Ligand binder design. Structure first.
Ligand SMILES: Nc1ncnc2c1ncn2[C@@H]1O[C@H](COP(=O)(O)OP(=O)(O)NP(=O)(O)O)[C@@H](O)[C@H]1O
Ligand SMILES: Nc1ncnc2c1ncn2[C@@H]1O[C@H](COP(=O)(O)OP(=O)(O)NP(=O)(O)O)[C@@H](O)[C@H]1O
Ligand SMILES: Nc1ncnc2c1ncn2[C@@H]1O[C@H](COP(=O)(O)OP(=O)(O)NP(=O)(O)O)[C@@H](O)[C@H]1O
Ligand SMILES: Nc1ncnc2c1ncn2[C@@H]1O[C@H](COP(=O)(O)OP(=O)(O)NP(=O)(O)O)[C@@H](O)[C@H]1O
Ligand SMILES: [Mg+2]
Ligand SMILES: [Mg+2]
Ligand SMILES: [Mg+2]
Ligand SMILES: [Mg+2]
Lengths: 751, 644
């Protein structure tokens, strides 16, 4: 126990010199921020790095990137010693050479291509024998410091000499700094955290676990859409833990002749038990162990049973962890999802917008992006793209850039100039074309995300906001108060009202306010599941809400599935609707126990909504969303026109005036049509300008800046002229009538 | 390390304990159990430990010397199963321990036992416990292990297992995962599978000429097993190791937390109440997760290079309620969709009013169950079919649960949606399972809530002409209730909020013929309902519950409960706003005097009730009330002409 012994962990910044320490620990050790320190790890390796303050880290831990850890021969979970060394001296000369494996191909003036940008700006520490990674030219180059002056530890300065005229140096048992790690996986922070907490603790410290006597889980099953990771996560975990990684591949096992498959499985498990700590990644485990209802062979059953027997025998193990991978858990035999066998299941799903941005940054870090390349725009425009698609579009952009620049460089040269590679800047046009030429792969997969819609996006409905805060936010963020008061709240809400009122924007808004997950489900999506025959899919959705708690499971378009049996149901023989309704009722009955799952509904046909959904426990909190009044219409106009140029002569108050019985959708269509008219006018004006130029191309160029297009009052007048109502007053009065009669359907009624 | 103060000193400090040389005693702590053997005692082999007595534990570890593992699974390591374990003991212990007496008597006891239940509920644990407690030669045949070995070797392994069991008599042959070995013929599509099934059947038949051999199979459900195995000589006894009730979950948690030192405020009762649908495996996994969280928290204290952890550190690792709460949040149930047989906690006090209904239910259900001899003596048998009808929210379910609790009989809750969603009625066998369960759990109260969705009148009341699921399920229910009349101690209760569309077939004698009307609560009933709902909640004294009960005509109990919920929501909002204002005041002047006048005693003020009533509304129209009153004399008149 010493104040300078700290447990290494993953870092935030990717630089090879910055090391972040908790300010409390630095103050305890009396360390000046932004100064040089020395870190010692395992064997006898040590490094010199500049420290910095980071309150996010914990006192007993220090954060470093894979480069420094590799230099120290320390994995995650190890302990390192830190010593103040402010006496470090600037070096007069440094002899640095690259590595043969990493620099294969590219040749030329590597110095100015890689090292000069890497050292020109910041004064960086350097230690003899250390390897640092430089990214550029669509590749990463590892440079080993052959020699330093005046001592093994030095600080590079602008006046310092750099010598890189030597030949490539061998790797000499060094690990590939480009190996997959936690920094090469993006869009998965919660799942990766769970995997780390399960795996790193036993594998790095097996002696402590076997001395304690507690048995940690060994069965891990990563399920998710193809291209979402899984294989990448297992390799990253194996490389970060250093555990003996055995990659069992489903098809590889299933190709080898009968009897050899069982032999291969047995050998894999036995060898894993010999190289403990170890990992056994079973990729494509669905082929090995499909459902019995699907397999139609004997050898398949024999292999399934052998796998089950081996997993059972792994109870008497040697720190062995099995890490399977499949597209979905349903295709796997149920026997594998039991105790001792694969009992932990991690969903590597489709990343949200920030996850896609992280993936793009990961796959574009080796490339020099040109200006105006807004990765945020691409991430926002890449809905339904799994990490593989985002890696493929970046590759397509890089290939387009290479094709464009090929005409510059003759195609017979074996090695391309390093300066040329570093000067190949990928333009936003390349990414736009690649995105246009690419299509999503997980578009039909259920998406769990926090919606961007906020309260400001919706105008009016203040009382509805109050009720939703009292009904949803308080149970979630303040459950202790509800438990104390002596009774539990209801987790079922039902929005009803005219179409276009903003039910979906309210569900998303409350989800964003509570910072809870949001799952959007529509009746058409439920029914189209083989016309309701694939019932299990429904049970999946609720299960997902159970994993993503807190959650807001929204059921839009309930008027198509929750149709009253007989009276409201359009199809007597259409058993899909009744089947799905009964499944929903059963699952909502089973969901009451889960405290942090809230189920919301939405129907524009409250008369035909089945009264079973109105039972307590189920969707019993009826909420009526009326047509916006004058002030509500003004607010909706402001919201719709937000982030758009509008002329000052437009009196939005006048537009809100009159216009009775207009839903928000109609108001948005008004703005869209007005914008279409404005676009037509701008196009016509540009055409007239082009014609005038063609008549007299020598005319004075009146460059008075690009015209600031704004929605003029004439455009709004035309849009209103062609605009129309979407809710008749008869519907309004019927909704008002059902504002006191919808609840009265569970008893006598429904006719 | 210092094992003495870690284990022995707490074990001997309080009580004066006897000790005998050569005996081993078990001490639990530090997530492990330690067996200590008494090497020497004074003044004789038998002694009593006292505070002044010297204890010497500086010697090296001692060998086991053929002693049995005191941590081996036993009847004390299995919880949530007392009736089933009692049956297993009565079947197994008597012959195995006393085979000579049984072979001298000449009576043949059963040999085929089949433990069926959801995964994680035991089965494997029960068999090991029985084997260890009886000392019988235990042979563990594993389904996948047999099915992996090449063709011809599987039959050889089965034959060797049975032959060796017949040599080490008394013996036991636990066939785990027997569904893989012997699945239904309709599912198996191979020859080797049929050969193994037939070999198993032949061996079980040959076990008629046995040597005190008992076969103890295990499967998830009996349906997946070939029917041939459920016959005489073969697996004829079937034991359901189901999901434990609340007390069973508490026992499981105590079993899995006895080696760990629980900190104060760790209320295992709260966890058991919050762990509905959790099989024993889930409850063992959540405890493990809590222990691992505690270990992770305490790891920073102890360097991670040490091979052995200090015993004092292990004994000082106290698991906090926060760890269990996080583990429960991160865990999910496994048997949530499984039918649950339990005695409900609802009592008569939970329901207000309906005194005449209570009288009728006591005369109709309790007396036949607790006093069947009187009914038999009087000369005729009662009816086992009841049907609650009335406005929604009146308290039918709370009455069924209440009568079940009063009779201390099992209660099975079944809803129409649960029946229909069984592959849209195609998996008909599931229905026949439910009644069978009521036959095992006698006395029982099999409740059918939401009968308005399945018992819809054929054509007139049925919403789907092509929806054969409803008619199929209704016919299955009718057949099973016809077959259930013989079982004296099974009572079937129904509940429908649409009595007009209820099929008249269910009104036939033998079936649900005792019609019971549950009306909307009157003023006194509303007062009682308000008292029941506000029970176990803080309420201000200024609130005149009598005034709330006054007026408020045509309000069901559900509406009254929603009133209280909304009032509580308003109170919570007010408390949150007051706390926010307090925080703002502190931020403006953090040096202000701390007025620590105890935490505010939040109570539902009359203003909150006024607001809730303002936003409250009725759920039953007077038209519905009068229609229900009309059907109070017309519902029975549907079996003959009617239904239109
Ligand atoms: N979350 C991610 N973050 C970063 N790169 C990713 C991510 N997901 C996929 N990739 C990249 O895309 C490649 C292909 O996806 P990969 O995860 O290897 O396929 P998989 O999920 O194993 N496919 P399957 O086993 O058929 O479902 C990876 O090797 C990475 O290069
Ligand atoms: N209160 C509002 N403020 C601003 N825009 C609104 C509002 N209500 C509706 N809108 C606009 O109208 C669109 C449709 O509203 P939405 O929330 O989808 O209504 P819905 O009733 O769920 N739709 P539907 O089922 O098709 O009748 C929104 O996406 C906005 O563009
Ligand atoms: N009723 C119980 N009481 C105490 N511990 C239990 C109970 N049920 C399960 N456990 C614990 O959970 C572990 C796993 O359950 P176990 O009963 O061994 O699985 P199983 O029922 O044989 N599974 P399967 O054969 O696939 O249906 C046991 O070994 C015990 O540690
Ligand atoms: N007599 C009562 N005393 C107290 N609370 C009651 C009473 N009746 C109903 N409640 C409350 O109302 C809830 C619903 O009653 P329940 O017994 O489920 O009626 P139901 O008619 O079976 N329901 P549904 O089929 O949804 O119309 C109960 O769980 C209580 O919270
Ligand atoms: Mg893969
Ligand atoms: Mg909608
Ligand atoms: Mg088992
Ligand atoms: Mg009911």
């Amino acid at each position: 126990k010493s104040p300078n012994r700290l447990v290494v962990d993953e870092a935030i910044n990717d630089d090879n010199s910055v090391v972040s320490l908790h300010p409390a620990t630095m103050e305890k050790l009396q360390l000046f921020r932004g100064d040089t320190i020395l870190i010692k790890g395992k064997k006898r390796k040590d490094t010199v790095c500049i420290a910095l303050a980071d309150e996010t880290c914990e006192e007993p831990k220090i954060r470093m990137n894979k480069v420094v850890r590799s230099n120290l021969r320390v994995r995650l979970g190890d302990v390192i010693s830190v010593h103040q060394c402010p006496d470090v001296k600037y070096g007069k000369r440094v002899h640095i050479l690259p590595v043969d494996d990493t620099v294969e191909g590219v040749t030329g003036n590597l110095f100015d291509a890689y090292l000069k940008p890497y050292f020109l700006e910041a004064y960086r520490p350097v230690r003899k024998g250390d390897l640092f990674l430089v990214r550029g030219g669509m590749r990463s180059v590892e440079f080993k410091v052959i020699e330093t002056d005046p001592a093994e530890y030095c600080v590079v300065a602008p006046d310092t000499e750099i010598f890189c005229e030597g030949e490539p140096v061998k790797r000499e048992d060094e690990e590939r700094l480009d190996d997959v790690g936690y920094d090469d996986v993006g869009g998965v922070r919660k799942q990766m955290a769970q995997i780390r907490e399960l795996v790193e603790l036993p594998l790095r410290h097996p002696q402590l676990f076997k001395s304690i006597g507690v048995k940690p889980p060994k069965g891990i099953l990563l399920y998710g859409p193809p291209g979402s990771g899984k294989t990448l996560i297992a390799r990253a975990v194996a490389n970060e833990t250093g555990a003996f990684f055995f990659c069992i591949n489903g098809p590889e096992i299933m190709s080898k002749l009968a009897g050899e498959s069982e032999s291969n499985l047995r050998k894999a498990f036995e060898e894993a038990e010999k190289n403990a700590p170890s990992i056994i990644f079973i990729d494509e485990i669905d082929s090995i162990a499909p459902k019995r209802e699907k397999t139609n062979g004997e050898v398949e059953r024999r292999i399934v049973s052998q796998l089950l027997t081996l997993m059972d025998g792994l109870k008497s193990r040697a720190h062995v962890i099995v890490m399977g991978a499949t597209n979905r858990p349903n295709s796997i035999d149920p026997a594998l999802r039991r105790f001792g066998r694969f009992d932990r299941e991690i969903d590597i799903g489709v990343p949200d917008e920030i996850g896609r941005l992280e993936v793009l940054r990961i796959h574009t870090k080796n490339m020099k992006l040109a200006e105006d390349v807004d990765l945020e725009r691409i991430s926002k425009d890449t809905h339904g793209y799994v990490g593989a698609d985002l890696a493929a579009l970046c590759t397509e952009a890089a290939l387009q850039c290479i094709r464009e620049k090929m005409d510059v460089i003759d195609l017979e040269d074996d090695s391309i100039d390093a300066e040329i590679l570093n000067s190949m800047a990928v333009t936003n046009e390349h990414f736009h074309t690649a995105l246009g030429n690419s299509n999503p792969s997980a578009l039909r997969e259920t998406v769990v995300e926090v919606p961007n819609v906020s309260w400001n996006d919706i105008g009016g409905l203040e009382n509805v906001k109050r009720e939703l805060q009292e009904t949803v936010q308080y149970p979630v963020e303040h459950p202790e108060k509800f438990e104390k008061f002596g009774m539990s709240p209801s987790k079922g809400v039902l929005f009803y009202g005219p179409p276009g009122c903003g039910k979906t924007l309210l569900a998303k808004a409350i989800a964003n306010e509570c910072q809870a997950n949001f799952i959007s489900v529509k009746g058409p999506e439920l029914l189209t599941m083989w016309f309701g025959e694939s019932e299990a899919n429904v049970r999946e959705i609720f299960d997902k809400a159970r994993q993503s708690a807190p959650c807001v499971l929204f059921f839009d378009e309930l008027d198509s599935i929750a149709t009253q049996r007989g009276g409201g149901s359009g199809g007597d023989g259409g058993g899909a609707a009744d089947r799905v309704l009964n499944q929903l009722l059963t699952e909502m009955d089973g969901m009451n126990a889960k405290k942090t799952v809230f189920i919301i509904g939405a129907t524009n046909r409250p008369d035909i909504i089945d009264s079973a959904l109105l039972r307590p426990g189920r969707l019993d909190q009826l909420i009526y969303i009326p047509l916006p009044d004058e002030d509500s219409r003004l607010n909706i106009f402001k919201a719709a026109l937000r982030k758009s140029p509008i002329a000052k002569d437009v009196d939005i108050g006048a537009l809100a005036k009159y216009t009775q019985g207009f839903s928000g959708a109609d108001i948005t269509e008004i703005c869209q049509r007005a914008c279409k008219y404005a676009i037509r006018e701008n196009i016509e004006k540009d055409i007239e300008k082009e014609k005038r130029r063609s008549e007299n191309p020598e005319a004075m160029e009146e460059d008075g800046v690009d015209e600031v297009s704004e929605i003029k009052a004439a455009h709004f007048e035309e849009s209103m002229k062609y605009a129309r109502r979407s809710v008749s007053d008869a519907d309004i009065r019927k909704y008002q009538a059902f504002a006191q009669t919808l609840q009265q359907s569970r008893g006598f009624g429904s006719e």
